[PDB]
A paper describes a structure:
Bacteriophage PR772 is a ﻿double-stranded DNA (dsDNA) virus with a 70 nm diameter icosahedral protein capsid encapsulating the internal lipid bilayer along with numerous proteins and a 15 kbp long linear genome. It belongs to the Tectiviridae family and infects gram negative hosts like Escherichia coli, ﻿Salmonella typhimurium and other bacteria, carrying a R772 plasmid-encoded receptor complex through which DNA can be transported during bacterial conjugation. In previous studies on PRD1, it was shown that the capsid is formed by proteins P3 (major capsid protein), P30 (capsid associated protein) and the vertex complex.
The structure of bacteriophage PR772 was determined by electron cryo-microscopy. The overall resolution determined by Fourier shell correlation (FSC) @0.143 was 2.75 Å. The resolution in most of the regions was high enough (3.2 Å – 2.3 Å) to build a de-novo model of the asymmetric unit comprising of P3, P30, P5, P31 and P16 into the icosahedrally averaged CryoEM map. The high-resolution structure of PR772 confirms the previously shown variability of the N and C-terminals of the P3 protein depending on the locations within the trisymmetron. The high-resolution also allows us to extend the analysis of these conformations and show that the N-terminal of P3 can adopt three different conformations, not two as previously described. Our studies show that unlike what was predicted for PRD1, the penton base of PR772 is an asymmetric heteropentamer consisting of three copies of P5 and two copies of P31.
Residue numbers in the entry:
A (entry chain H): 11 to 99
B (entry chain H): 150 to 384
C (entry chain N): 30 to 58, 96 to 117
D (entry chain R), F (entry chain S): 2 to 126
E (entry chain O), G (entry chain P), H (entry chain Q): 1 to 124
I (entry chain G): 298 to 346
The structure:
């Protein structure tokens, strides 16, 4: 098939340009939002990222302050544990 | 995260997530070029409220964080989040404009989850792969009605093709042996991982491949959660 | 000794897709190609018979 | 629970699309009745002019004390407007545009009425 | 919380404008003991009406309710006691209909085939 | 009951399609109505500007205690809005747009009102 | 007076005509055990239905209410007790649905995918 | 007797299909003392939503009424107490909204931007 | 101390612009991505390879 040579020549020009961007550009990591809330009020939030360059991922740091108000009994961590702090992304 | 939170105590938790767009650091496939004028770039996030993070004893601890006899009075005091964006600045500009990996930014790299039901003991349960995606990994969580077991409720797991042909029909201990040479440990009990990074499941150039779980014991309201990871383009 | 339709031994290559071959087409598609349909059957039978 | 089909059904054709002319209503009152049936024969207007159908209807029973029926002939549709209401009603009318109106009020009630020929959705405020 | 459903159907429907015209079908019925079947498959094959899209049910004199059921879908639209109405309907290329009532009565019904938005003449 | 036809009906033309300009609306207010009839003459806006007709109307009687009428001139349609409701009402208005409003409240009620120029279906929540 | 807001959620929807067909899905719901999750992501990926745009909810014999929730949006369409109805929904490429009720019941539910205007059979 | 008005305003609107997508915005409102202002001018300039055309107002658990007011046109759509509903609104390119209620409470609100017709779940 | 005495660690360029500016727990998270553990208490690593 003659159409499998152009789609391999388009991969060769693409991989030539990938190693130009990764070698001749600057990796930046900057904070876009931070917010502290109470989950009784709201728990779904929207984050507007920065519109610059070639975005290649997000690092999300979630903290919590769980308090047990029971009289005598305790709770224990589940198997998934703190990975259930973000319900959906 | 602390292992237990006693009556009257307060536990401090922290947790990090990497939401990927590009496939890796050296492979810019799935990356996003966000230098567009009227950009609609967006990152939604939902968090655990006081109804989904504390399960009672005998409940389903799947989306929960803590579970015990005192979960009826557990509550959050705060949740704080911080988002950091990793990107590449100072792109090479030429005479005709930007120099970019064009069919690397045209490709998406996606992560989806689902939930299937209808499991019967000693009957194969097939979940079909979508024909438009090139699947890279598969994660199956056998949630056996609020109970998780370390392989003692599954006969086998497989990746069956369209005719009837199986490609990896393994015992749950031998299935875990294949993931131990990838992530060097075991996933938690009930979680099963299938790696296809050396040869992705395209299921458009070789038939209709499905994912099979043959269970041994099925409780009431037992479901099978299926996480996917795949490439997507317009070829 | 070369043949213009010989794809290899016919009991080993009859159900084999070609090299690139993401999705295969059908060999014919009144409603579509007709003499291209008839020559796609003659070329296949010449592969199974060796000139 | 037994099932029983039926013998024969009817099949007419309608005017559910847009006019080659503009939207045009026809104000049909001076029908002060209380005891009779009132025929509207719009076949006069359908061929002398380009009034190529009746699609919707507007009935105004704001001071009428009883209901108000209008019947289409070749279709057999039997739209009845309520007592003190008013509103728009889509219709199933063929090219032979004929209508028969009725009444149940407390004397002749002078009900204003409009034959629309274009599409307006239901609402019976 | 949030247990998962096992099996659901997937059916094709009628939603466009026919190659003919707006064509309804008067199908006055009488239940009088249990049920009435309406089969319009003969009209679909023999060049007539191309698929029911809307119902017009006219029960202003009937003292009970009238139910119309599609067998290929399972939708069971139930018109109320002394009301007239237009009802959009989920019907297939197989136009079978199970009509029911309580005891008696005769109801004018129009199988309409073109989209009309919903409405019901009295409310409350 | 015997079938009796009638003598004569009228036929005006309307504005049921989309504007060549944009969707527009006209607000009519400060309606301190001690005098009952109030004229709205939108013929000033139709020829000077591009306000090429009134198709729908929005009446807000949320604080009104009585009903509220609006009358079209060439058509004779006399849409009445209920007491404590608000909603949208399609209209039959010709190219020479004049309106007459009236009232049955308990003093002047100020009645915010909009002349809508495009198509909005009925709903009187 | 004049208290500005901080966070809103922008999200894309399904509002056009499918280039497949008008395709609805019967997914009869069993409650009096939990809340019910419906996931149609498998149908969207495997070539079937493109996106739920309208709901048909049939509550004729039920004594309570029925709530259907979209998780990407937060829309909480709640059908009432003895009524049937068509309801347009704001739903995304994720076709996940949280179905709930008050006590019991079996509900015929149709995930319609084409626009049908709203209507409810009895009102009040 | 036969009086004529003096002054009336003219406003240009949003009434067509966006060349983006069907896009609604969840903007859950808590008032709890007086009033709440919503300003969507930032989204309109920064490439997001083109203009609000419909509201979805969800008042099931709220025991009073809810008023939403457009400032450019003066339209003041008022939702009833225990009802949900879709409401077309007359809004300008300046997409400001003044939401009000009686006393308390939180209710979901969606700013829809594409035309949906009316509808209110219980009536009367 | 384990990051409790530092507000943020960063790296600036000529026009005073931070090309990374992280929390001490986020600075240590990028360390765990490379050496699969934490450096000892008070040690902060920055990879630029």
């Amino acid at each position: 098939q003659q159409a499998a040579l152009r789609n391999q020549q388009a991969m060769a020009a693409n991989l030539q340009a990938r190693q130009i961007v990764l070698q001749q550009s600057y990796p930046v990591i900057q904070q876009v939002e931070t917010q502290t809330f109470d989950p009784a009020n709201r728990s779904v939030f929207d984050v507007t990222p920065a519109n610059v360059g070639i975005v290649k991922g997000f690092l999300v740091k979630v903290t919590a302050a769980i308090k047990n108000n029971h009289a005598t009994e305790a709770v224990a961590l589940t198997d998934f544990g703190p990975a259930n702090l973000v319900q959906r992304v | 995260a602390p292992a237990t939170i006693a009556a009257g105590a307060t536990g401090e938790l922290t947790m990090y997530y990497w939401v990927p767009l590009a496939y890796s650091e050296t492979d810019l496939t799935g990356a996003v070029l966000a230098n567009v004028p009227q950009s609609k770039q967006r990152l939604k996030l939902e968090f655990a409220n006081n109804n989904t993070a504390f399960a009672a004893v005998g409940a389903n601890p799947l989306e929960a964080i803590y579970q015990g006899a005192g979960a009826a009075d557990c509550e959050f005091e705060e949740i704080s989040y911080t988002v950091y964006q990793s990107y590449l600045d100072q792109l090479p500009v030429g005479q005709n404009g930007y120099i970019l990996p064009l069919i690397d930014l045209s490709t998406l790299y996606n992560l989806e989850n689902s939930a299937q039901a209808g499991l019967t003991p000693n009957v194969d349960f097939v979940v079909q792969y979508a024909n438009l995606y090139r699947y890279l990994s598969t994660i199956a969580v056998f949630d056996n009605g609020g109970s998780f077991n370390a392989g003692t409720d599954i006969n086998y797991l497989s990746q069956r093709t369209a005719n009837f042909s199986d490609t990896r029909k393994l015992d749950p201990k031998t299935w875990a042996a294949q993931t131990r040479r990838r992530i060097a440990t075991d996933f938690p009990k009930g979680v099963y991982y299938c790696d296809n990074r050396d040869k992705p499941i395209y299921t458009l150039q070789y038939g209709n491949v499905g994912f099979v779980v043959n269970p041994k014991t099925v409780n009431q309201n037992a479901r099978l959660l299926m996480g996917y990871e795949y490439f997507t383009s317009r070829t | 000794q070369v043949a213009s339709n010989w794809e290899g031994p016919p009991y080993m290559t009859y159900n084999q897709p070609q090299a690139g071959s993401v999705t295969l087409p059908v060999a014919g598609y009144i409603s579509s190609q007709l003499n291209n349909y008839a020559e796609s059957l003659n070329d296949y039978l010449a592969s199974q018979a060796g000139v | 629970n037994v099932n029983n089909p039926n013998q024969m059904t009817v099949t007419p054709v309608y005017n559910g699309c847009d006019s080659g002319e503009g939207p045009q209503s026809v104000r049909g009152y001076f029908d002060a009745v209380a005891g009779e049936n009132v025929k509207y024969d719009l076949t006069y207007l359908a061929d002398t002019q380009g009034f190529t159908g009746v699609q919707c209807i507007y009935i105004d029973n704001a001071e009428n004390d009883g209901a108000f029926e209008i019947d289409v002939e070749e279709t057999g549709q039997r739209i009845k407007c309520p007592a003190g209401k008013q509103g728009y009603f889509p219709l199933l009318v063929p090219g032979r545009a004929k209508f028969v109106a009725r009444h149940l009020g407390s004397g002749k009630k002078s009900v204003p009425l409009f034959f629309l020929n274009f599409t307006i959705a239901q609402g019976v405020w | 919380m949030a247990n998962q459903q096992i099996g659901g159907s997937t059916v094709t429907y009628n939603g466009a404008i026919p190659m003919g015209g707006p064509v309804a079908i008067n199908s006055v019925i009488e239940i009088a003991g249990t049920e009435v079947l309406v089969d319009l498959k003969l009209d679909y094959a023999t060049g007539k009406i191309s698929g029911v899209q809307t119902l017009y049910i006219d029960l202003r004199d009937f003292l009970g309710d009238v139910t119309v059921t599609m067998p290929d879908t399972g939708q069971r639209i139930t018109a109320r006691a002394g009301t007239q109405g237009y009802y959009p309907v989920l019907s297939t290329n197989l136009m079978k209909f199970i009509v029911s009532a309580t005891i008696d009565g005769k109801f004018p019904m129009n199988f309409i085939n073109f989209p009309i938005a919903l409405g019901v003449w009295p409310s409350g």
